[model samples]
Target: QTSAVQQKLAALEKSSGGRLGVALIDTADNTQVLYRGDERFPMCSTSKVMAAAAVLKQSETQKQLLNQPVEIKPADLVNYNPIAEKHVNGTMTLAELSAAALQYSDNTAMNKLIAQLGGPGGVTAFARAIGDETFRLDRTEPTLNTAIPGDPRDTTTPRAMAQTLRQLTLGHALGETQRAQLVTWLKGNTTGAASIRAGLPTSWTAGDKTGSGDYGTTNDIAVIWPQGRAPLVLVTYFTQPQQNAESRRDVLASAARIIAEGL
Candidate 1:
């Protein structure tokens, strides 16, 4: 019949009641399992991971890109931001904006990056250049995700996100300095802390991104390193929360445990 991993996945799907997509890769063994992995799902803030790489690429030529100041006006603010909420208007560097974008899933900060990185097409071009075929950065942000067509907000297959992260973990496209910075931000990110970290054993280390949007979107893309062992990459998405799930947090956490403990 079904293996333990399969059983857990089945249970997760049954409870979620939404379209669930997952791609789990054992980087150590070169093996993987895909469940609805090819389907497109809204990337929400999770797309920040890709956006970060693109912006960082710009830094290669613009030595002061990250430190350069960008203005934030009243029209730029969005929720999930304490910085903007304080009405502290002025300029902030790309680095600080990126920090808020990735670490806190701040939309205003990310919108700044979107402007600098050449908008949504910029993100899509970066993905295509890297051979990540499933991503389509069609929308500027998640708020417009509801009215847009073609998956609305940015979209990607679970396997595609997993593959993209794997490339990043292995230092693809970026030099040592940039890679180190990206990894550091991801490790420090508090966004997905509850989603994957909560399910892992205390000793494990992980860097992850989380996304949510219309139609039950809950997605997490992560790179997990077990104590003294090779790491694994996992990308998961659960959609239609209203019809299919209360939240996909537990399903993601449980699947992570299955991979980490191998039980």
Candidate 2:
């Protein structure tokens, strides 16, 4: 099954103007393609997955409480409209911020969570602890900050991102309880509109993340499949100046469907 899937994937890559690069793994078997495309491309928001992992790891190590309330001040506001409208100058729990970060891809939520976790240094430390040497956090202040220093945007490889997911799933990145919480949080992720969600049946459940940049880059990482069948981790990276959101969506959906059917 793995070999057959690889062959189909190769053909798909060849047919797509060779613009799409992918890495996939069967967590149930530890089967994988180690390198695919530009493995070191800037990961954009997809880096949030690692950021989330970092937070979870810290929570486990320090015995941090997720349910405890964390204050959301004006400095933590990444999106002005929401800050001005919804939160209404109030505070929220770390758990709520984490959910907002994963579920809505809220920059403010991510900034708050990262701050609570001790900034990018903390995130980097967590990534290292999890054995993800390629993942790096941006140095600038949280997205809420005014000044952007050196494009303070995180980037990573598809392989690294998949490896992070693998570690989280295997309970190696965080303790058992933290791992369960992490998976539960990821299952609520609503950002991956292009690829992972496009592949499965409407009723099928998947836990995944999606990212897009100002330049033409689109990415999705997810554990996808119906409950009864084995789950597979799929990571796709698309980089092409001509690619628009719809085109990227089609490309990811097509590639994911092909891989899922082959599996």
Candidate 3:
């Protein structure tokens, strides 16, 4: 039965000119299928998920107040135009910046938070803390001026992402308070809603983070229906798409819905 589903998914991808890659995991049944699971793709803003987690972990360990203020210098700004410059030039609480990073996919806010968490080493530590050895932070200077040269900065396997979400949901990755913060932050993430969250019912509670970057890569990692009868982690990435946005959205939504229905 799983094999049949794979064939159907592959057919859907081929129909879209073979530019789509999808990976879905059923946490309840412990099953997964991938079109290009091993292929690394740009994490875009989805990298913020790991960054946020890393910061939260460190904060919890140090017993730092989440509301403590952190100054944001002018150099830390990314993707912000001059009009939005005021917020970038001032101080923001660690919690506020982290929330901004996830909710608005703010690159400046994310890099600032990443720096506060101890730069790449901190991100590495967080990944290790979560038992995800495959995840890596971008190697470039922790500034908003640089472009992520490759996929490494925000890259993760479907298995790794799904497992991370599951761990957080199960309170295995961070302490109860920290885990709650992570979940709350994710639930407020507004990006990448077209994929994972698009398939669920209107009333279902879903939390998701999305990434988009060069090469037309789109990725979404999310936990769906947290309080519903069926709760699962859904991680998907599509690269080199030949289809239009509506088509890709439909394909992804249908795939997620099918998996949910099967569960």
For model 3, how does the per-residue alpha-carbon lDDT over 1-263 read when each residue is reduced to its tens digit?
A: 44666666677667654244456655556667665566565555677888877777777767766777777777766564232256755778778878887887776677666777677667767887778887767542233222233435556666676777778765478888888888888887766568767776677787888766544556677877644455677777665532233225555666666555545
Ranked candidates (TM-score, high to low) = 1, 3, 2
Worst 10 residues of 2 by lDDT: 141-150
Instruction: Write the number of the candidate with greater lDDT, choosing between 1 and 3.
Output: 1
The alpha-carbon root-mean-square deviation between model 2 and the true structure, to one decimal in Å, is 4.3
Each candidate: RMSD to true structure? 2.5, 4.3, 3.7
- Model 2: residues >4 Å from true position, as ranges? 1-18, 34-38, 61-64, 79-85, 139-153, 242-247
Please report, in order, the local distance difference test score of every candidate based on alpha carbons. Answer: 0.76, 0.66, 0.66
**Each candidate structure's count of clashing pairs:** 6, 0, 0
The alpha-carbon root-mean-square deviation between model 1 and the true structure, to one decimal in Å, is 2.5
lDDT of 2 by residue, 207-242 (tens): 887766543566677876665666777788765544
* Candidate 2: residue 106 lDDT (0-100): 71
Better of 1 and 2 by TM-score: 1
Best model number under lDDT? 1
Q: Give the CA lDDT, 0 to 100, for residue 85 in model 1.
A: 47
Query: Candidate 3 — which pairs collide?
Result: none
Clashing pairs in 1: 16-244, 17-244, 18-244, 215-240, 216-240, 216-241
